[PDB]
Amino acid sequence: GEELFTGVVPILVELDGDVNGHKFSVRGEGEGDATNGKLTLKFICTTGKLPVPWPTLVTTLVQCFSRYPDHMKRHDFFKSAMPEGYVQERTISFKDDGTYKTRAEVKFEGDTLVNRIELKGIDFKEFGNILGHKLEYNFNSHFVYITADKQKNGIKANFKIRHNVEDGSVQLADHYQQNTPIGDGPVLLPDNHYLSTQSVLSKDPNEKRDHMVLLEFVTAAGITH
């Protein structure tokens, strides 16, 4: 299960979204390096301009690439559900604004880890921070708290994402998350821990499509050796 992740692994991310009727698609490729907890990905909006700001899609656009330290390896649900993978479901509530609901299947197809997502955003204020494009092009650092969901043979997670707003203020996105194994084989259910996540966003200066270049670093912690 973890063996699938010892080297560099090609990644494919595919998102279809509908926000307040804006229909759009994102495709991203790149590679993950679970050993160092590192992703590098380029994302393209294939339907034209992205109708929401890129930072809001970041948590939706593969936590199996988290680097778990040796002494925590028994708490890695993500890798253990591999290669048949897992389903990852989120409700994301933007403070004083709309909601994303997301459903993704994360699994291997051949040598490639694939994150396939449908996204539905409703109730967004036009001229709010999201449909208004008022979020800075960057991303902050967070703790993702994970807990075992024994009855669904999976895990749950809560966290608040803080999005920098161009006027200096911060927009909250309350994330609720459930992951559930695809396939009836055995998986690892973790003691309570967290993932520490850090992300850098940039642009390709030769890319003319609307896009995001993403670097991510994640390590699991919160369980004392």
Structure tokens at 182: 């695809």
Query: Residue 7 corresponds to which tokens in the numbers above?
Result: 């080297």
Resolution of the deposited coordinates, in angstroms?
2.5
Alpha-carbon distance 191 to 105, whole Å?
Answer: 24
Give dist(CA 220, CA 196) in Å, integer: 6
CA dist 193 to 21, 27, 158, 225, Å? 37, 31, 12, 12
- The two tokens of residue 85 are 């993978």
Measure the CA–CA gap between 156 and 105, rounded to whole angstroms: 16
Instruction: Give the method of determination.
Output: X-ray
Domain ranges of the chain: 1-225
- Tell me which CATH homologous superfamily contains domain 1-225: Green fluorescent protein (2.40.155.10)
Is residue 177 within 8 A of residue 171, CB to CB? The reply is no
